[PDB]
Design a protein around this motif. Sequence first.
Motif, PDB file in Angstrom:
ATOM      1  N   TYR A  90       0.654  -1.237  -0.042  1.00 22.93           N
ATOM      2  CA  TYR A  90       0.057  -0.012  -0.127  1.00 22.93           C
ATOM      3  C   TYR A  90       0.704   1.488  -0.017  1.00 22.93           C
ATOM      4  N   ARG A  91       0.221   2.314  -0.671  1.00 21.51           N
ATOM      5  CA  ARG A  91       1.122   3.426  -0.833  1.00 21.51           C
ATOM      6  C   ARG A  91       1.183   4.419   0.201  1.00 21.51           C
ATOM      7  N   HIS A  92       2.117   4.138   1.242  1.00 21.60           N
ATOM      8  CA  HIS A  92       2.158   5.089   2.216  1.00 21.60           C
ATOM      9  C   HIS A  92       3.077   6.410   1.990  1.00 21.60           C
ATOM     10  N   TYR A  93       2.353   7.516   1.754  1.00 20.73           N
ATOM     11  CA  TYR A  93       3.124   8.736   1.291  1.00 20.73           C
ATOM     12  C   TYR A  93       3.644   9.259   2.564  1.00 20.73           C
ATOM     13  N   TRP A  94       4.935   8.801   2.996  1.00 18.65           N
ATOM     14  CA  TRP A  94       5.489   9.551   4.265  1.00 18.65           C
ATOM     15  C   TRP A  94       6.750  10.114   4.118  1.00 18.65           C
ATOM     16  N   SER A  95       6.879  11.382   4.231  1.00 17.66           N
ATOM     17  CA  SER A  95       5.856  12.454   4.003  1.00 17.66           C
ATOM     18  C   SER A  95       5.643  12.434   2.410  1.00 17.66           C
ATOM     19  N   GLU A  96       4.725  12.807   1.781  1.00 17.51           N
ATOM     20  CA  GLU A  96       4.917  13.384   0.563  1.00 17.51           C
ATOM     21  C   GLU A  96       5.720  14.292   0.372  1.00 17.51           C
ATOM     22  N   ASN A  97       6.774  14.356  -0.891  1.00 15.56           N
ATOM     23  CA  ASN A  97       6.715  13.236  -1.908  1.00 15.56           C
ATOM     24  C   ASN A  97       7.624  11.978  -1.759  1.00 15.56           C
ATOM     25  N   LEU A  98       8.192  11.694  -0.573  1.00 18.45           N
ATOM     26  CA  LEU A  98       8.561  10.335  -0.496  1.00 18.45           C
ATOM     27  C   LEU A  98       7.459   9.312  -0.216  1.00 18.45           C
ATOM     28  N   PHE A  99       7.606   8.125  -0.817  1.00 19.75           N
ATOM     29  CA  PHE A  99       6.441   7.465  -0.009  1.00 19.75           C
ATOM     30  C   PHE A  99       6.976   6.032   0.273  1.00 19.75           C
ATOM     31  N   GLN A 100       6.511   4.985   0.659  1.00 18.52           N
ATOM     32  CA  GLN A 100       6.870   3.645   0.492  1.00 18.52           C
ATOM     33  C   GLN A 100       5.580   2.749   0.431  1.00 18.52           C
ATOM     34  N   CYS A 101       5.839   1.765  -0.385  1.00 12.92           N
ATOM     35  CA  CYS A 101       4.533   0.710  -0.057  1.00 12.92           C
ATOM     36  C   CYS A 101       5.161  -0.127   0.920  1.00 12.92           C
ATOM     37  N   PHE A 102       4.194  -0.173   2.012  1.00 12.01           N
ATOM     38  CA  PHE A 102       4.347  -1.117   3.267  1.00 12.01           C
ATOM     39  C   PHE A 102       3.561  -2.267   2.779  1.00 12.01           C
ATOM     40  N   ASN A 103       3.668  -3.330   3.344  1.00 10.36           N
ATOM     41  CA  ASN A 103       2.905  -4.511   2.881  1.00 10.36           C
ATOM     42  C   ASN A 103       1.462  -4.479   3.452  1.00 10.36           C
ATOM     43  N   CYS A 104       0.405  -4.759   2.746  1.00 11.57           N
ATOM     44  CA  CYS A 104      -0.902  -4.658   3.127  1.00 11.57           C
ATOM     45  C   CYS A 104      -1.170  -5.773   4.317  1.00 11.57           C
ATOM     46  N   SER A 105      -1.726  -5.105   5.430  1.00 10.32           N
ATOM     47  CA  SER A 105      -1.788  -6.023   6.539  1.00 10.32           C
ATOM     48  C   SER A 105      -3.171  -6.353   6.400  1.00 10.32           C
ATOM     49  N   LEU A 106      -3.388  -7.798   6.340  1.00  8.26           N
ATOM     50  CA  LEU A 106      -4.554  -8.488   6.674  1.00  8.26           C
ATOM     51  C   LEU A 106      -4.927  -8.321   8.309  1.00  8.26           C
ATOM     52  N   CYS A 107      -6.235  -8.311   8.824  1.00  7.95           N
ATOM     53  CA  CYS A 107      -6.460  -7.905  10.114  1.00  7.95           C
ATOM     54  C   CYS A 107      -5.783  -8.944  11.149  1.00  7.95           C
ATOM     55  N   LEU A 108      -5.290  -8.350  12.119  1.00 11.80           N
ATOM     56  CA  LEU A 108      -4.885  -8.793  13.451  1.00 11.80           C
ATOM     57  C   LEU A 108      -6.146  -9.340  14.247  1.00 11.80           C
ATOM     58  N   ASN A 109      -6.711 -10.476  13.447  1.00 13.22           N
ATOM     59  CA  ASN A 109      -8.030 -10.919  13.986  1.00 13.22           C
ATOM     60  C   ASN A 109      -9.089  -9.890  14.421  1.00 13.22           C
ATOM     61  N   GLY A 110      -9.497  -9.508  13.444  1.00 16.83           N
ATOM     62  CA  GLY A 110     -10.958  -8.439  13.512  1.00 16.83           C
ATOM     63  C   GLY A 110     -11.780  -8.819  12.462  1.00 16.83           C
ATOM     64  N   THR A 111     -12.687  -8.157  12.397  1.00 19.17           N
ATOM     65  CA  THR A 111     -13.525  -8.057  11.119  1.00 19.17           C
ATOM     66  C   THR A 111     -13.206  -6.930  10.121  1.00 19.17           C
ATOM     67  N   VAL A 112     -12.736  -7.469   9.187  1.00 18.92           N
ATOM     68  CA  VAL A 112     -12.530  -6.459   7.757  1.00 18.92           C
ATOM     69  C   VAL A 112     -13.391  -5.404   7.620  1.00 18.92           C
ATOM     70  N   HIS A 113     -12.994  -4.119   7.678  1.00 18.83           N
ATOM     71  CA  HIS A 113     -13.828  -3.129   7.268  1.00 18.83           C
ATOM     72  C   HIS A 113     -13.409  -2.969   5.862  1.00 18.83           C
ATOM     73  N   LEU A 114     -12.304  -2.004   5.769  1.00 19.80           N
ATOM     74  CA  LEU A 114     -11.972  -1.369   4.342  1.00 19.80           C
ATOM     75  C   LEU A 114     -11.083  -2.612   3.672  1.00 19.80           C
ATOM     76  N   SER A 115     -11.065  -2.885   2.426  1.00 17.76           N
ATOM     77  CA  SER A 115     -10.054  -3.545   1.946  1.00 17.76           C
ATOM     78  C   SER A 115      -8.911  -2.671   1.588  1.00 17.76           C
ATOM     79  N   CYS A 116      -7.829  -3.352   1.491  1.00 14.87           N
ATOM     80  CA  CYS A 116      -6.617  -2.758   1.190  1.00 14.87           C
ATOM     81  C   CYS A 116      -6.457  -2.111  -0.068  1.00 14.87           C
ATOM     82  N   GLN A 117      -6.294  -0.788  -0.066  1.00 13.43           N
ATOM     83  CA  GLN A 117      -6.329   0.085  -1.318  1.00 13.43           C
ATOM     84  C   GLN A 117      -5.049   1.110  -1.443  1.00 13.43           C
TER      85      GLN A 117
END
Lengths: 142, 140
Positions: A90-117
């Motif tokens: 996922y595209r973590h702009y920190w701070s823009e305008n550098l950014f990195q892709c961190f990995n998409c975290s699946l939930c640490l056992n909860g219910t999914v709300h927003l999917s990774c985007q």
Amino acid sequence: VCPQGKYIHPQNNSICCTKCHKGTYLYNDCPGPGQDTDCRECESGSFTASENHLRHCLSCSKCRKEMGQVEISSCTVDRDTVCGCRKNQYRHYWSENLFQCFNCSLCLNGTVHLSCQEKQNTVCTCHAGFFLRENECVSCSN
Amino acid sequence: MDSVCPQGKYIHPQNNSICCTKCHKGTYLYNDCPGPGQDTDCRECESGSFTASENHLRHCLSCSKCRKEMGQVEISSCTVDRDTVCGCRKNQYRHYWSENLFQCFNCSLCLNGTVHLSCQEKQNTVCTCHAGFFLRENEC
Ligand SMILES: *c1cc(-c2cc3c(cc4n3C(=S)N(CCCN3CCOCC3)C4=O)s2)cc([N+](=O)[O-])c1
């Protein structure tokens, strides 16, 4: 002044030439009204993004790959490269305008709300009344 | 290269080896260009009109009207080289009902609990229930 899309002739501040186009530099300034401007195209690999009157193109920039990046449409006369995010990280702009892709975290056992985007990681809310924590589902203070 | 005319030029409707620079954005084709060393003639766009970008284009397109049929406002002027842009009033979140149709929908006064993600232009608030159930679909 020079209306839309014309610029001022350096040599004679009374003549207005078309601005080049995306992709092309100015090889030389148009000789007198009525006249075309010499816009010769960009030697790949280079570009210009826009109307311009630039004496050179800006080189291709490669991706800051330290940030687990990959570009995904190549730099090409108008387009500077677009880098973006590797196979569903996922595209973590920190701070823009550098950014990195961190990995998409699946939930640490909860219910999914927003999917990774592309702007945001997967978003969690949680199983069994645990105290909610971004991804993590952590019971309480413990 | 693999081309016809090069970058920045169109072929003439007539002399199929005259090429002409394209009309800029902001500007239309007044008349096509005479022969290879004079510019195409491009006149400004009339007010309340604009055009893409690289046009060899006869007419400007007319501006746009914001759809109040979905809760909008022109957030910026339409002016010659950019359309009227619209959006939802501060702050509703905007819902692209097919990327092109799009709605105005309100932010949530934090529904079901407390404020996680502040709400904004793209997207709603996200909250979390002060009564932990576990997202069945869309409630708590
Ligand atoms: C700036 C400029 C434009 C464009 C205007 C048009 C595009 C595609 C077409 N138009 C027009 S005006 N048009 C006319 C149809 C011609 N037909 C007549 C009947 O016989 C067949 C041919 C087009 O086809 S692009 C667009 C934007 N923009 O961003 O959309 C901005």
